[PDB]
Protein backbone atom coordinates (compact mmCIF):
# COMPACT_ATOMS: atom_id res chain seq x y z
CA UNK A 1 0.00 0.00 0.00
CA UNK A 2 1.39 3.42 -0.95
CA UNK A 3 0.96 6.42 1.40
CA UNK A 4 1.97 10.02 1.41
CA UNK A 5 4.89 10.48 3.73
CA UNK A 6 5.81 13.91 5.08
CA UNK A 7 6.47 15.64 8.39
CA UNK A 8 5.54 19.24 9.23
CA UNK A 9 7.25 21.16 12.03
CA UNK A 10 5.41 24.52 11.73
CA UNK A 11 7.17 24.68 8.34
CA UNK A 12 6.38 23.49 4.81
CA UNK A 13 7.50 19.89 5.24
CA UNK A 14 4.10 18.64 4.10
CA UNK A 15 3.91 21.01 1.14
CA UNK A 16 2.98 19.82 -2.37
CA UNK A 17 6.58 19.95 -3.44
CA UNK A 18 8.08 18.25 -0.31
CA UNK A 19 5.62 15.33 0.00
CA UNK A 20 7.09 11.86 -0.64
CA UNK A 21 5.06 8.77 -1.56
CA UNK A 22 6.13 5.72 0.49
CA UNK A 23 5.33 1.98 0.27
CA UNK A 24 4.52 0.28 3.54
CA UNK A 25 6.10 -2.75 5.19
CA UNK A 26 4.29 -6.10 5.06
CA UNK A 27 1.46 -6.23 7.64
CA UNK A 28 0.75 -2.45 7.80
CA UNK A 29 -2.71 -1.84 6.28
CA UNK A 30 -3.48 1.87 6.81
CA UNK A 31 -2.08 5.25 5.86
CA UNK A 32 -2.08 7.86 8.60
CA UNK A 33 -2.40 11.61 8.66
CA UNK A 34 -2.26 13.50 11.94
CA UNK A 35 -2.34 17.26 12.20
CA UNK A 36 -2.16 19.00 15.55
CA UNK A 37 -2.82 22.74 15.45
CA UNK A 38 -1.99 24.66 18.63
CA UNK A 39 -3.44 28.11 19.10
CA UNK A 40 -2.23 30.91 21.26
CA UNK A 41 -3.85 34.25 21.56
CA UNK A 42 -1.12 35.60 19.21
CA UNK A 43 -0.84 32.92 16.56
CA UNK A 44 -1.15 29.27 15.68
CA UNK A 45 1.16 26.67 14.20
CA UNK A 46 0.83 23.06 13.24
CA UNK A 47 2.67 19.84 13.62
CA UNK A 48 1.76 17.21 11.01
CA UNK A 49 2.85 13.67 10.19
CA UNK A 50 1.75 11.68 7.14
CA UNK A 51 2.92 8.11 6.69
CA UNK A 52 2.21 4.39 6.94
CA UNK A 53 0.13 3.48 9.94
CA UNK A 54 -1.13 0.59 12.02
CA UNK A 55 -4.45 -0.28 13.43
CA UNK A 56 -7.82 0.30 11.83
CA UNK A 57 -9.35 2.93 9.55
CA UNK A 58 -11.05 5.75 11.35
CA UNK A 59 -11.26 9.41 12.26
CA UNK A 60 -10.41 10.86 15.61
CA UNK A 61 -10.80 14.59 16.33
CA UNK A 62 -10.08 16.33 19.63
CA UNK A 63 -9.97 19.80 21.04
CA UNK A 64 -7.81 20.49 24.07
CA UNK A 65 -7.62 23.41 26.51
CA UNK A 66 -4.60 24.09 28.73
CA UNK A 67 -5.22 27.33 30.67
CA UNK A 68 -6.34 29.00 27.54
CA UNK A 69 -4.00 27.41 25.07
CA UNK A 70 -6.15 25.60 22.61
CA UNK A 71 -4.97 22.64 20.63
CA UNK A 72 -6.92 20.96 17.84
CA UNK A 73 -6.02 17.50 16.60
CA UNK A 74 -7.38 15.58 13.63
CA UNK A 75 -6.05 12.05 13.12
CA UNK A 76 -7.32 10.09 10.10
CA UNK A 77 -6.45 6.55 8.99
CA UNK A 78 -7.68 5.12 5.67
CA UNK A 79 -7.09 1.87 3.80
CA UNK A 80 -6.68 3.08 0.18
CA UNK A 81 -3.52 4.19 -1.58
CA UNK A 82 -2.35 7.83 -1.08
CA UNK A 83 -5.49 8.49 0.88
CA UNK A 84 -3.75 10.24 3.77
CA UNK A 85 -3.91 13.80 2.33
CA UNK A 86 -7.47 14.75 3.27
CA UNK A 87 -6.83 17.19 6.15
CA UNK A 88 -6.25 21.01 6.03
CA UNK A 89 -5.97 46.10 23.79
CA UNK A 90 -3.05 45.20 26.10
CA UNK A 91 -3.55 44.14 29.67
CA UNK A 92 -0.64 44.61 31.99
CA UNK A 93 1.27 41.45 31.08
CA UNK A 94 3.95 40.76 28.49
CA UNK A 95 5.15 37.22 27.59
CA UNK A 96 7.77 35.66 25.37
CA UNK A 97 6.06 34.14 22.32
CA UNK A 98 7.12 30.98 20.43
CA UNK A 99 4.58 30.10 17.75
CA UNK A 100 6.43 28.12 15.10
CA UNK A 101 10.07 28.76 15.92
CA UNK A 102 12.61 25.93 16.26
CA UNK A 103 14.18 24.87 19.52
CA UNK A 104 17.13 26.95 18.28
CA UNK A 105 15.29 30.26 18.11
CA UNK A 106 13.02 29.45 21.04
CA UNK A 107 15.66 29.48 23.76
CA UNK A 108 16.17 31.74 26.76
CA UNK A 109 15.38 35.45 26.20
CA UNK A 110 15.64 35.13 22.37
CA UNK A 111 11.92 34.87 21.35
CA UNK A 112 9.77 37.88 20.53
CA UNK A 113 7.77 39.54 23.26
CA UNK A 114 3.99 39.71 23.04
CA UNK A 115 1.49 41.86 24.90
CA UNK A 116 -1.22 39.77 26.48
CA UNK A 117 -4.86 40.76 26.28
CA UNK A 118 -8.17 39.52 27.61
CA UNK A 119 -9.10 37.41 24.59
CA UNK A 120 -12.77 36.47 24.40
CA UNK A 121 -13.33 38.43 27.64
CA UNK A 122 -11.20 35.90 29.63
CA UNK A 123 -8.13 37.10 31.52
CA UNK A 124 -4.74 36.05 30.05
CA UNK A 125 -2.24 37.26 32.71
CA UNK A 126 0.23 34.38 33.08
CA UNK A 127 3.08 33.25 30.85
CA UNK A 128 3.62 29.79 29.50
CA UNK A 129 6.64 27.74 28.44
CA UNK A 130 6.37 24.18 27.29
CA UNK A 131 6.35 22.07 24.21
CA UNK A 132 3.84 20.31 21.90
CA UNK A 133 4.41 16.80 20.64
CA UNK A 134 2.59 14.85 17.98
CA UNK A 135 3.42 11.18 17.28
CA UNK A 136 2.23 9.08 14.31
CA UNK A 137 3.70 6.68 11.74
CA UNK A 138 6.39 5.61 14.26
CA UNK A 139 7.71 9.21 14.04
CA UNK A 140 7.53 11.95 16.69
CA UNK A 141 7.54 15.70 16.20
CA UNK A 142 7.71 18.49 18.77
CA UNK A 143 8.22 22.23 18.96
CA UNK A 144 8.36 24.61 21.91
CA UNK A 145 5.34 26.75 22.80
CA UNK A 146 5.29 30.07 24.63
CA UNK A 147 2.60 32.67 25.17
CA UNK A 148 -0.04 34.08 27.44
CA UNK A 149 -2.30 31.80 29.46
CA UNK A 150 -5.00 32.20 32.11
CA UNK A 151 -2.92 30.58 34.86
CA UNK A 152 0.26 31.93 36.46
CA UNK A 153 1.01 28.86 38.62
CA UNK A 154 0.95 25.66 36.57
CA UNK A 155 4.03 23.41 36.74
CA UNK A 156 4.38 20.55 34.30
CA UNK A 157 0.76 20.61 33.47
CA UNK A 158 -0.40 18.89 30.34
CA UNK A 159 -3.24 17.78 28.16
CA UNK A 160 -3.24 14.67 25.96
CA UNK A 161 -4.88 13.48 22.77
CA UNK A 162 -4.31 10.69 20.27
CA UNK A 163 -0.56 10.72 19.69
CA UNK A 164 -0.52 14.30 20.93
CA UNK A 165 0.59 16.11 24.04
CA UNK A 166 0.80 19.76 25.03
CA UNK A 167 2.71 20.35 28.25
CA UNK A 168 4.75 22.90 30.12
CA UNK A 169 4.70 25.29 33.01
CA UNK A 170 3.19 28.67 33.78
CA UNK A 171 4.52 31.65 35.71
CA UNK A 172 3.57 35.11 37.02
CA UNK A 173 5.03 38.45 35.99
CA UNK A 174 5.92 39.82 32.61
CA UNK A 175 8.42 37.69 30.66
CA UNK A 176 8.78 35.30 33.57
CA UNK A 177 8.69 32.51 31.00
CA UNK A 178 12.34 33.05 29.99
CA UNK A 179 13.10 29.37 30.66
CA UNK A 180 11.05 27.09 32.90
CA UNK A 181 12.42 23.67 32.04
CA UNK A 182 13.88 23.37 35.41
CA UNK A 183 10.93 24.62 37.42
CA UNK A 184 10.41 22.45 40.56
CA UNK A 185 7.23 21.63 42.53
Amino acid at each position, epitope marked *: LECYSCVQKADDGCSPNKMKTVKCAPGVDVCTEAVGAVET*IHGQFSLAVRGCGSGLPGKNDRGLDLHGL*LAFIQLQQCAQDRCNAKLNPPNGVECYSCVGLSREACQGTSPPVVSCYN*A*SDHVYKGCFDGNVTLTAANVTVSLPVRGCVQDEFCTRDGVTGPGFTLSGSCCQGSRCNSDLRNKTY
Partner: antibody
Amino acid sequence: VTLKESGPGILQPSQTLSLTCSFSGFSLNSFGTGVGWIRQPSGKGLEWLAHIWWNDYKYYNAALESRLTISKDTSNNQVFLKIASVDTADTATYYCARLRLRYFDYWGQGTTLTVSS
Amino acid sequence: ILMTQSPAILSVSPGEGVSFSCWANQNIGTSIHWYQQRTNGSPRLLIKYASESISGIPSRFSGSGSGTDFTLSINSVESEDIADYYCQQSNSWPIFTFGSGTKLEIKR
Protein backbone atom coordinates in the same frame (compact mmCIF):
# COMPACT_ATOMS: atom_id res chain seq x y z
CA VAL B 1 -24.56 41.98 19.66
CA THR B 2 -27.32 39.99 17.92
CA LEU B 3 -27.93 36.60 16.37
CA LYS B 4 -30.86 35.73 14.11
CA GLU B 5 -31.66 32.17 13.10
CA SER B 6 -33.69 31.45 9.99
CA GLY B 7 -34.98 28.19 8.69
CA PRO B 8 -37.65 26.47 6.65
CA GLY B 9 -40.29 26.28 9.41
CA ILE B 10 -41.75 22.94 8.30
CA LEU B 11 -40.19 19.89 6.61
CA GLN B 12 -41.35 16.37 5.78
CA PRO B 13 -39.30 13.43 7.21
CA SER B 14 -36.09 12.48 5.27
CA GLN B 15 -35.46 16.02 4.03
CA THR B 16 -32.38 18.09 4.79
CA LEU B 17 -32.66 20.82 7.35
CA SER B 18 -30.61 23.88 6.45
CA LEU B 19 -30.33 26.57 9.14
CA THR B 20 -28.66 29.96 8.84
CA CYS B 21 -27.41 32.06 11.76
CA SER B 22 -26.96 35.69 10.76
CA PHE B 23 -25.04 37.62 13.40
CA SER B 24 -23.86 41.18 14.02
CA GLY B 25 -21.99 43.19 16.66
CA PHE B 26 -19.02 40.77 16.71
CA SER B 27 -16.64 38.71 14.57
CA LEU B 28 -15.86 35.03 14.13
CA ASN B 29 -12.21 35.93 13.56
CA SER B 30 -11.49 36.57 17.28
CA PHE B 31 -9.45 33.94 19.14
CA GLY B 32 -11.79 31.94 21.32
CA THR B 33 -14.97 32.99 19.55
CA GLY B 34 -17.31 30.32 18.36
CA VAL B 35 -20.88 29.95 17.24
CA GLY B 36 -22.92 26.95 18.22
CA TRP B 37 -26.29 25.44 17.59
CA ILE B 38 -28.60 24.32 20.36
CA ARG B 39 -32.09 22.98 20.09
CA GLN B 40 -34.97 22.45 22.48
CA PRO B 41 -37.93 20.19 21.82
CA SER B 42 -41.03 21.91 23.19
CA GLY B 43 -41.43 21.32 26.93
CA LYS B 44 -38.05 19.59 27.12
CA GLY B 45 -34.45 20.58 27.83
CA LEU B 46 -31.68 22.13 25.81
CA GLU B 47 -29.30 19.98 23.76
CA TRP B 48 -26.04 21.18 22.27
CA LEU B 49 -25.59 20.07 18.68
CA ALA B 50 -22.52 21.70 17.16
CA HIS B 51 -20.23 24.72 17.30
CA ILE B 52 -17.70 26.17 14.84
CA TRP B 53 -14.69 28.21 15.78
CA TRP B 54 -12.96 31.26 14.44
CA ASN B 55 -10.14 29.01 13.14
CA ASP B 56 -12.67 26.73 11.23
CA TYR B 57 -12.54 23.79 13.73
CA LYS B 58 -15.92 22.08 14.26
CA TYR B 59 -17.33 20.03 17.16
CA TYR B 60 -20.43 17.90 17.09
CA ASN B 61 -22.73 16.09 19.45
CA ALA B 62 -21.52 12.57 18.93
CA ALA B 63 -24.99 11.17 18.91
CA LEU B 64 -25.63 13.30 15.78
CA GLU B 65 -22.11 13.53 14.26
CA SER B 66 -23.34 11.50 11.31
CA ARG B 67 -26.29 13.77 10.55
CA LEU B 68 -24.55 17.11 11.29
CA THR B 69 -22.34 19.42 9.25
CA ILE B 70 -21.66 23.01 10.45
CA SER B 71 -19.97 25.71 8.42
CA LYS B 72 -19.38 29.44 8.28
CA ASP B 73 -18.87 32.34 5.89
CA THR B 74 -17.03 34.97 7.96
CA SER B 75 -17.25 37.54 5.19
CA ASN B 76 -21.09 37.70 5.44
CA ASN B 77 -21.28 37.01 9.24
CA GLN B 78 -23.09 33.70 8.82
CA VAL B 79 -22.93 30.25 10.30
CA PHE B 80 -24.85 27.36 8.75
CA LEU B 81 -26.09 24.03 10.13
CA LYS B 82 -27.59 21.38 8.01
CA ILE B 83 -28.99 18.23 9.43
CA ALA B 84 -29.59 15.45 6.98
CA SER B 85 -32.44 12.92 7.09
CA VAL B 86 -34.82 14.82 9.34
CA ASP B 87 -37.26 12.85 11.57
CA THR B 88 -40.08 13.67 13.98
CA ALA B 89 -37.48 13.93 16.79
CA ASP B 90 -35.99 16.93 15.03
CA THR B 91 -39.13 18.92 15.88
CA ALA B 92 -37.61 21.58 18.11
CA THR B 93 -36.78 25.22 18.54
CA TYR B 94 -33.24 25.73 17.27
CA TYR B 95 -31.14 28.57 18.76
CA CYS B 96 -27.81 29.95 17.70
CA ALA B 97 -25.68 31.43 20.44
CA ARG B 98 -22.21 32.79 20.54
CA LEU B 99 -19.47 30.84 22.28
CA ARG B 100 -17.07 32.92 24.32
CA LEU B 101 -14.53 30.13 24.68
CA ARG B 102 -16.56 28.13 27.25
CA TYR B 103 -20.12 29.58 27.56
CA PHE B 104 -23.02 30.89 25.36
CA ASP B 105 -23.26 34.63 26.31
CA TYR B 106 -25.58 35.80 23.41
CA TRP B 107 -28.48 33.78 21.93
CA GLY B 108 -30.96 34.35 19.12
CA GLN B 109 -34.71 34.29 19.53
CA GLY B 110 -34.83 30.83 17.97
CA THR B 111 -36.47 29.42 14.87
CA THR B 112 -39.17 26.83 15.33
CA LEU B 113 -39.15 23.77 13.10
CA THR B 114 -41.96 21.25 12.69
CA VAL B 115 -41.19 17.96 11.00
CA SER B 116 -44.41 16.50 9.66
CA SER B 117 -45.64 15.23 6.37
CA ILE C 1 -19.76 13.89 32.74
CA LEU C 2 -23.32 13.61 34.14
CA MET C 3 -25.25 16.67 35.34
CA THR C 4 -28.29 16.37 37.58
CA GLN C 5 -30.32 19.37 38.49
CA SER C 6 -32.41 19.45 41.60
CA PRO C 7 -35.10 19.96 42.24
CA ALA C 8 -36.87 19.69 38.88
CA ILE C 9 -39.70 21.93 40.15
CA LEU C 10 -39.10 24.49 42.90
CA SER C 11 -42.38 26.04 44.18
CA VAL C 12 -41.62 29.36 45.82
CA SER C 13 -43.40 32.52 47.11
CA PRO C 14 -42.30 36.03 45.95
CA GLY C 15 -39.58 37.43 48.24
CA GLU C 16 -38.00 34.16 49.42
CA GLY C 17 -34.35 33.19 49.15
CA VAL C 18 -34.30 30.26 46.76
CA SER C 19 -31.46 27.90 45.79
CA PHE C 20 -30.98 25.61 42.75
CA SER C 21 -28.65 22.67 42.87
CA CYS C 22 -26.60 21.29 39.97
CA TRP C 23 -24.57 18.20 40.72
CA ALA C 24 -21.74 16.70 38.68
CA ASN C 25 -20.89 13.00 38.93
CA GLN C 26 -17.20 14.07 38.61
CA ASN C 27 -15.02 16.97 39.66
CA ILE C 28 -15.42 19.75 37.11
CA GLY C 29 -13.57 22.47 38.95
CA THR C 30 -15.46 25.70 38.36
CA SER C 31 -16.53 24.94 34.76
CA ILE C 32 -20.29 25.49 35.28
CA HIS C 33 -22.51 28.20 33.82
CA TRP C 34 -26.14 29.14 34.51
CA TYR C 35 -28.85 30.12 32.06
CA GLN C 36 -32.31 31.59 32.53
CA GLN C 37 -35.09 30.82 30.04
CA ARG C 38 -38.34 32.58 30.61
CA THR C 39 -41.32 30.91 28.91
CA ASN C 40 -41.37 31.70 25.16
CA GLY C 41 -37.97 33.36 25.56
CA SER C 42 -34.40 32.58 24.67
CA PRO C 43 -31.90 31.25 27.21
CA ARG C 44 -30.08 34.10 28.98
CA LEU C 45 -26.62 33.68 30.56
CA LEU C 46 -26.84 34.41 34.33
CA ILE C 47 -23.69 33.07 36.02
CA LYS C 48 -20.27 32.38 34.58
CA TYR C 49 -17.70 29.92 35.98
CA ALA C 50 -19.78 28.87 39.03
CA SER C 51 -19.98 32.32 40.61
CA GLU C 52 -18.91 35.14 38.28
CA SER C 53 -21.75 37.66 37.72
CA ILE C 54 -22.78 38.72 34.21
CA SER C 55 -23.16 42.40 33.27
CA GLY C 56 -26.78 43.48 32.99
CA ILE C 57 -28.04 40.68 35.26
CA PRO C 58 -29.97 41.62 38.42
CA SER C 59 -27.91 41.49 41.59
CA ARG C 60 -30.36 39.03 43.19
CA PHE C 61 -28.94 36.19 41.07
CA SER C 62 -25.81 34.68 42.61
CA GLY C 63 -24.08 31.32 42.28
CA SER C 64 -21.55 29.30 44.21
CA GLY C 65 -19.73 26.03 44.49
CA SER C 66 -16.67 24.25 43.19
CA GLY C 67 -15.86 20.62 42.41
CA THR C 68 -19.05 18.56 42.20
CA ASP C 69 -21.91 20.60 43.75
CA PHE C 70 -22.99 23.99 42.45
CA THR C 71 -25.82 26.31 43.46
CA LEU C 72 -27.73 29.24 41.98
CA SER C 73 -29.49 31.49 44.46
CA ILE C 74 -31.97 34.34 44.17
CA ASN C 75 -31.75 36.76 47.12
CA SER C 76 -35.26 38.16 46.58
CA VAL C 77 -37.53 36.45 44.06
CA GLU C 78 -39.48 38.80 41.78
CA SER C 79 -42.41 37.91 39.53
CA GLU C 80 -40.32 37.83 36.36
CA ASP C 81 -37.90 35.29 37.84
CA ILE C 82 -40.39 32.45 37.08
CA ALA C 83 -38.36 30.54 34.52
CA ASP C 84 -36.34 27.49 33.68
CA TYR C 85 -32.76 27.48 34.88
CA TYR C 86 -30.14 25.38 33.14
CA CYS C 87 -26.52 24.68 34.05
CA GLN C 88 -23.93 23.80 31.44
CA GLN C 89 -20.48 22.35 31.94
CA SER C 90 -17.38 23.38 30.08
CA ASN C 91 -15.20 20.77 31.75
CA SER C 92 -14.87 18.73 28.61
CA TRP C 93 -14.25 21.59 26.23
CA PRO C 94 -15.06 21.65 23.30
CA ILE C 95 -17.90 19.20 24.25
CA PHE C 96 -20.63 21.08 26.12
CA THR C 97 -23.44 19.50 28.12
CA PHE C 98 -26.54 21.04 29.77
CA GLY C 99 -28.56 20.04 32.77
CA SER C 100 -32.14 18.82 32.72
CA GLY C 101 -33.34 22.15 34.04
CA THR C 102 -35.08 23.52 37.14
CA LYS C 103 -38.44 25.14 36.60
CA LEU C 104 -39.22 27.84 39.13
CA GLU C 105 -42.95 27.74 40.15
CA ILE C 106 -44.96 30.14 42.34
CA LYS C 107 -46.58 28.84 45.52
CA ARG C 108 -50.25 29.50 46.17
